[PDB]
Symmetry: C2
Subunit: 236 residues, 2 copies
């Protein structure tokens, strides 16, 4: 009777502690990626039209090792410098048309894109985009690609194993990271039907098993971190 509610207290408190820990992990990874992007862009702005300098920066190992891919597209001749070993842009690739470029140019600051199809890996990715200025003139934009399987591994750092999993969506419920990447770029409702996108805990039924969904928001980009938990397994 009162133990039921005591147990419920323990369960909800531990879910929220688990999710906030994961939320801090995501915030920390994002902030450090943004800081790197911001500094790299500022450094390239010392001589932005110097393609040889730009390539050298993007090929430097720590930076190259921090993102799936990095590149700079130019507003003038639609050319692109990038550090993707296994990709060279087609004759009809135009960076100015790409969402990282459009977002960065529109907002005139560092942006994180919505999920979109990568030209190189043909997968859903997200990118950090930044504008590049030559003494107050916009001369192009940069992308810093983020691999989403890696992001999914990160939110599932804590290992819920067979008890459940964590995922990430945008503010509009579009999936950013999930153990099955096939969900990425789609509305999260396709693997969690009739679940509202809001902070807090929801209890749902399928079969005659109960599941707990906990959402928490990442303020910087308004992402939602979600956890799905099998009660029977997680609290046996």
């Amino acid at each position: 009777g009162s133990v039921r509610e005591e147990i419920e207290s323990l369960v909800q408190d531990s879910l929220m502690e688990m999710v906030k820990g994961v939320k801090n992990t995501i915030e920390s990874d994002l902030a450090s990626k943004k800081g790197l992007a911001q500094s790299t862009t500022e450094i390239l702005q010392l001589d932005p039209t110097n393609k040889a300098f730009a390539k050298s920066v993007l090929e430097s190992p720590n930076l190259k090792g921090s993102f799936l891919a990095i590149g700079l597209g130019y507003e003038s001749d639609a050319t692109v410098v990038e550090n993707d070993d296994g990709w060279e842009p087609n004759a009809d690739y135009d960076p100015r048309k790409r969402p990282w470029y459009v977002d960065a140019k529109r907002e005139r600051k560092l942006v994180v894109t919505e999920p979109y199809v990568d030209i190189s890996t043909k997968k859903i990715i997200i990118s950090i985009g930044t504008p590049v200025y030559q003494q107050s003139n916009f001369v192009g934009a940069m992308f810093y690609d983020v691999e989403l399987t890696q992001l999914a591994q990160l939110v599932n750092s804590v290992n819920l194993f067979d008890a459940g999993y964590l995922f990430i969506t945008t503010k509009d419920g579009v999936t950013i990271a999930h153990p099955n990447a096939e969900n990425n770029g789609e509305k999260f409702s396709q693997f969690l039907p009739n679940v509202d996108l809001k902070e807090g805990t929801q209890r749902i039924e399928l079969d005659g098993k109960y599941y707990l969904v906990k959402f928490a928001q990442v303020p910087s980009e308004s992402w939602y971190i979600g956890a799905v938990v099998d009660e029977s397994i997680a609290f046996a």
Copy 2:
């Protein structure tokens, strides 16, 4: 009787959860600082003897805003490029003698120094030091200074207010960060006597008040994060 031990359980579990949260904060800040240092050094290694290029990089706003001060000392002519607005090196300043330089040269990789007296701010600081190479030749070293009051504010992010505080020491018990900076660079025993430096919880007496000390280690640099908690206030 059994409630006493139940209460003890709650207290110890919540202390450890508080400290591990703070430990992750420190680890995340350090890793992002190290990543920035590593990339900045690699970028400067594109043309390390170019003092004008080097200065331009160190003056770029995101990087300049991420550390108290940044500089590069050269092995050849003992000259130094730095971004400290309120400091210019004396005629007898020799970077090659400084602990960030000696540590970086000795270890041939990114290092975090022991606490030491800053030449510029005349305060105890720590630095990230990195070696600089010109095609496999050592041409000098860099410092990335870390202000310790800022570090103390960070470990005390969570606000224990009048219930207590957190601090940081090296593996040898030398204080790195404390609400009173006067403790920095000294053995922590001067504000916590008869307390062993080890992971776990210790209960101590002064007057007839009880205090809880919890230590947790930061693996990367073997720092210890400590929390001192007034039981009477924190668990009233």
